[PDB]
Ligand binder design. Structure first.
Ligand SMILES: CCS(=O)(=O)Nc1cc(-c2cc(NC3CCNCC3)c(=O)n(C)c2)cc2c1ccn2C(C)(c1ccccn1)c1ccccn1
Ligand code: NA
Length: 127
């Protein structure tokens, strides 16, 4: 099995805006998770070909990763903050579905998700 193409990250047919909350999601939330010790398996799509994990995209039909989220934020792909928060949540739940509770990758994702939730509780005031 091939890898799937990565999720779309640019679309000029989508209106674009800058907002307080989107700027925070890139400059604070994504930046804080990205520089964490455990970010690295989540910084790009799961490369099922390289990892010899041919079952990965047989089960995970909404893949998501922080590389994709970073590029979506940089390309103004999201209009609403919740569209970006949904993508972080998808990344975490994908990990929790594929991998057994307590597995190394799950403990890494849980350490990132704790920090994510703290930063989402500090989202700035909407326009
Ligand atoms: C940047 C994305 S990538 O190119 O796809 N690279 C990598 C991604 C991932 C990874 C693996 C997952 N699932 C597997 C399922 C089988 N058991 C292990 C976890 C997963 O859900 N996510 C989100 C990311 C692990 C990686 C590497 C590279 C090395 N590892 C290993 C060493 C790994 C394993 C566990 C925890 C952390 N790292 C690895 C070990 C065994 C098999 C595959 N990868
Ligand atoms: Na739109």
């Amino acid at each position: 099995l091939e890898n799937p193409p990565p999720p779309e990250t640019s679309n000029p047919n989508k209106p674009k805006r800058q907002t307080n909350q989107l700027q925070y999601l890139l400059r604070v939330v994504l930046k804080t998770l990205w520089k964490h010790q455990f970010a690295w398996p989540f910084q790009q799509p799961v490369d099922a070909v390289k990892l010899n994990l041919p079952d990965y995209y047989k089960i995970i039909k909404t893949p998501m990763d922080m590389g994709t989220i970073k590029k979506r934020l940089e390309n103004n792909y999201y209009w609403n903050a919740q569209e970006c928060i949904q993508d972080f949540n998808t990344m975490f739940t994908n990990c929790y579905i594929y991998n057994k509770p307590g597995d190394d990758i799950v403990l890494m994702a849980e350490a990132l998700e704790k920090l994510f939730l703290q930063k989402i509780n500090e989202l700035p005031t909407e326009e």
